[PDB]
Write an enzyme that holds these catalytic residues in place. Structure first.
Site, PDB file in Angstrom:
ATOM      1  N   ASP A   1       2.013   4.256  -3.427  1.00 17.44           N
ATOM      2  CA  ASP A   1       1.581   5.644  -3.546  1.00 17.44           C
ATOM      3  C   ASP A   1       2.750   6.585  -3.780  1.00 17.44           C
ATOM      4  OD1 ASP A   1      -0.849   4.482  -2.819  1.00 17.44           O
ATOM      5  OD2 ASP A   1      -0.508   4.928  -0.695  1.00 17.44           O
TER       6      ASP A   1
ATOM      7  N   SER B   1      -6.527   2.152  -6.174  1.00 17.60           N
ATOM      8  CA  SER B   1      -5.620   2.757  -5.202  1.00 17.60           C
ATOM      9  C   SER B   1      -4.337   3.236  -5.877  1.00 17.60           C
ATOM     10  CB  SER B   1      -5.283   1.774  -4.081  1.00 17.60           C
ATOM     11  OG  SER B   1      -4.408   0.762  -4.544  1.00 17.60           O
TER      12      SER B   1
ATOM     13  N   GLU C   1       0.824  -1.204   0.000  1.00 15.38           N
ATOM     14  CA  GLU C   1       0.000   0.000   0.000  1.00 15.38           C
ATOM     15  C   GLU C   1       0.863   1.261   0.000  1.00 15.38           C
ATOM     16  OE1 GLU C   1      -3.020   2.627   1.897  1.00 15.38           O
ATOM     17  OE2 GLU C   1      -1.919   2.677   0.002  1.00 15.38           O
TER      18      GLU C   1
END
Ligand SMILES: [Zn+2]
Ligand SMILES: [Zn+2]
Ligand SMILES: [Zn+2]
Ligand SMILES: [Zn+2]
Ligand SMILES: [Zn+2]
Ligand SMILES: [Zn+2]
Ligand SMILES: [Zn+2]
Ligand SMILES: [Zn+2]
Ligand SMILES: [Zn+2]
Ligand SMILES: [Zn+2]
Lengths: 356, 356
Positions: free
Chosen positions: B80, B276, B76
């Site tokens: 990003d 995401s 995760e």
């Protein structure tokens, strides 16, 4: 990355159910190669369909001549029968073998549409090439045969080509293929089909450039814009000068090898694509429709362009440019030089062709 | 089957050139996991971009806590930074680590948008879930924080979810995700991108059903149709009753793992997708735009919906249905509950946001 059987593709395009082309004959023009029939019987048996009758017809001395080439000649013949026969098993298949010449090509077509015994109502053609690479004589003669076929009540389907809007010519300009460019031919474009359970998830213009091929399509230099294509928003050619011409193609279907057809070539299972897979697919559709109507639809083009839009699945995404630079030509709402009217929805097409 | 670098995707979406988010700060809310920074420096070096400054901020005791899990937590965080940092290397990255609770989530967001030193102009959020699986209190509090962020001149971007129109709920109905459903959030949908040399060949709704995920999107039950979404042709919900709500999402971007992003997770290169991946992508775009404008764009939603259509690449093909049965929801011309206004065209968006 999911491959289909002809039955899967047929369900997605919603082919008329309870029909199999019984009492119809489909002609296939072959300018080289041949089929090994044990590989056919093996294919039809694994699909759970009755094997259709397939007869060979010699034109100008040419014969059903396979020899087990790894790729090439045999791939052409076995493909058409397997795709069209899996969808129209009730139909009789007449495969006309002729030498790879314009004389051979013309004779095979004139023999087919005048065949007194076999009487094909549908003719499927795969062999194509840039329209301007054809002599003026051959164009006129071949175009006459197609006009002859139309008056004889015979439907002719041709692949649009697997080399995008340039058509394999490097001169820096765009070229459509022939016989696809003929207005007396049902021109079949290529798409990439994603379907999962009888429904179309998404369908786009087939384009695996700048290497693995793209659907042919564009504007003809030779042939003027037909009267039935006037309300079709066909653009003038992208080439300099840019005058009106015949719009290619008329229809489109699954042609992407990545989402291709599960077939058996030379005894071994594999997956193939290309617009040459589309013409037999739609030939089966026409055969099925002819069964229901009780008479051959024959020349279809004018009727297709005056049917409601809901009859087709409009392809609106993707382009014909193998280089993906100028992005010519581009698909959009309604008719476009990549996919034509789009993929047909069999039941709706059949409904529209039934008497009022 | 071709994977991209963030730079490739950015060129396709035509991000404003000569800008890198210098003098901007991007906040990333993390409810678990962490990043190993040698794996970051390795990633940015192989891309030929300067490594952006990344600072960790502890919220409610939580810390930058990786431990080398094969999949999961670390995926995760590193994602990003790598996606947003490759496109906005001039931007400062503030990663706020908080416990995986609504208290932790709320505190990380309230801390971020009120950060006196770091002063983020952009907030990227990935964690999502069905809007009706949130308590009425948490919804009200979280929605208030977003309204607070908007008045503070901060842009908030959230992923729409990777489970299609049903959103992961099996009750037999459709559910949008939260915070994506908030009208004070820029909701990011997912697409499948085919681009080859700075141009979009084709872009469709991301849908790898019935197994591998699909873009979230639909109609909110909780939130009413905003005034800025009235001329957007947002349909009433597909669920029984079917009253108007907030339309999800607002924008969409490349999220298909098959056409995914080339990243480095836990020291090893791989390819990932999901919505995401979209929020950091567009967070970089906003950062770049803020650099040029000289002030933060802040709350963007109302402005986006009153901009010309040519600013976006309208996605018109594909559906949100992971089962591909009812085909709900379906993409089409203009705004749709699969891809919103579509993928943004950076230079045109920047032009439209510049003073007259
Ligand atoms: Zn004749
Ligand atoms: Zn030429
Ligand atoms: Zn392809
Ligand atoms: Zn498009
Ligand atoms: Zn179209
Ligand atoms: Zn505040
Ligand atoms: Zn529910
Ligand atoms: Zn996919
Ligand atoms: Zn469609
Ligand atoms: Zn749209």
């Amino acid at each position: 990355p999911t491959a289909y059987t002809p039955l899967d593709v047929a369900q997605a395009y919603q082919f008329p159910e309870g029909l199999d082309g019984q009492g119809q004959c489909i002609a296939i023009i072959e300018l080289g190669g041949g089929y090994d029939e044990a590989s056919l019987a093996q294919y039809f048996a694994s699909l759970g369909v009755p094997a259709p009758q397939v007869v060979s017809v010699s034109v100008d001395g040419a014969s059903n001549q396979p020899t087990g080439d790894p790729k090439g000649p045999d791939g052409e013949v076995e493909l058409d029968i397997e795709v069209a026969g899996a969808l129209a098993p009730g139909a009789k298949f007449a495969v006309y073998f002729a030498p790879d010449t314009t004389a051979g090509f013309l004779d095979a077509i004139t023999t087919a549409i005048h065949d007194p015994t076999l009487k094909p109502s549908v003719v499927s053609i795969s062999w194509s090439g840039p329209e301007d690479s054809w002599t003026s004589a051959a164009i006129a003669a071949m175009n006459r045969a197609f006009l002859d076929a139309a008056a004889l009540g015979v439907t002719v389907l041709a692949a649009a080509g697997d080399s995008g809007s340039t058509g394999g010519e490097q001169d820096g300009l765009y070229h459509v293929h022939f016989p696809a460019a003929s207005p007396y031919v049902l021109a079949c474009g290529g798409t990439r089909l994603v379907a999962s359970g009888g429904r179309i998830a998404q369908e786009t213009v087939w384009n695996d450039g700048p290497d693995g091929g793209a659907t042919g399509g564009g504007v003809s230099r030779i042939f003027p814009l037909p009267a039935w294509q006037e309300h079709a928003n066909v653009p003038p050619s992208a080439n300099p000068g840019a005058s009106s011409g015949r719009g290619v193609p008329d229809l489109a279907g699954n042609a992407d090898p990545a989402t291709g057809y599960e077939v058996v070539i030379d005894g071994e299972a594999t997956v193939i694509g290309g617009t040459s897979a589309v013409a037999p697919l739609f030939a089966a559709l026409v055969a099925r429709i002819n069964q229901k109507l009780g008479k051959a639809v024959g020349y279809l083009n004018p009727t297709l362009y005056q049917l409601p839009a809901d009859v087709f699945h409009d392809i609106t995404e993707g382009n014909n440019d193998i280089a993906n630079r100028a992005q010519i030509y581009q698909a959009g709402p309604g008719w476009d030089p990549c996919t034509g009217l789009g993929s047909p929805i069999g039941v709706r097409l059949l409904q529209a062709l039934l008497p009022s």
